Amino acid sequence: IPTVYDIYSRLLKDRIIMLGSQIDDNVANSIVSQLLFLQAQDSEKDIYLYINSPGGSVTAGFAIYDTIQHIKPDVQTICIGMAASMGSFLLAAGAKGKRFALPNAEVMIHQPLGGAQGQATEIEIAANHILKTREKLNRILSERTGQSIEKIQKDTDRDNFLTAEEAKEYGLIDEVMVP
Amino acid sequence: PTVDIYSRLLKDRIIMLGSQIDDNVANSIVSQLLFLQAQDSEKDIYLYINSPGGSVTAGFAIYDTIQHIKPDVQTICIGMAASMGSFLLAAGAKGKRFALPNAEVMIHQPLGGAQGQATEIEIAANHILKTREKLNRILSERTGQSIEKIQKDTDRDNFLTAEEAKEYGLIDEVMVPE
């Protein structure tokens, strides 16, 4: 809303990117472009990814994830309010040692959600795709948190809410940002 | 967000295909390609692709513009390239078609519909089988796979990892992070 430039555009000049909504293609495109822009301006200074998001599309989320990992700047991640689902995945994707949550923030992990409708054969293909998708996520989350794939598979079976402190013990973040 | 962000990347010859392919998208991508040629007809263009597909004719609008202009158009799949999306990824200058490591490529046969008299249904069926034939012919040439293999491999939704899309011939490199 307010003009400080708009407020987000003003934060962009300090290399802060806001991931403040559901993750869909439009949002991924914006964040990706923002990351590329900031790298081209300066390939050494940190970028700060501020996260308050219930998640969303997996492939949108991977567009963001791969772009983070591609660029030279370290991307710090900060959870404010909530990081759920692909939002928590992105929180864990930040540069090791520079992933934070504020103290009353909520992080939630769970399995991917989807759908499928049609012939037994189409449903099989859908089932196989989503299970492969889940293996991909779990493998990446393991490497990032230091938790095994077996433990991640167990802990994402149902919706699993973590406090900031629990997320730090889990390895999804490095530090509770304390006041 | 400002700093407009997409307009600033366009100065660097970067075009974003980051939505469903419809006629407005096609018109915009086409104009961007043409414009970039006009500014400089030697330098490479970069088409970034996060797209589930869409209209086949709109996708061909973009395809024919890529092939027609003098600059090479690199293609980079970020997130997802599905259906006409994957086609356009495959349409980039040979040796300059990439995907990021966790990006998804999907290929399948075209989709459509028809209602009315048997004769109208025949016409829609003929038109759609010809469209598939054209798409499979081009993909054969772009990937080096036979037509028979593309037909088989696209009969149903077929999801490929970045590394698989390389082996298949849809892209040339998986862009790994330095």
């Binding site: 081209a40 591609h70 | 010859r13 970069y46 970034y48 690199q74 300059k96 990439f98 862009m175």
Partner: peptide, 6 residues
Amino acid sequence: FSPXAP
């Protein structure tokens, strides 16, 4: 995405 595109 440079190097190499651009």
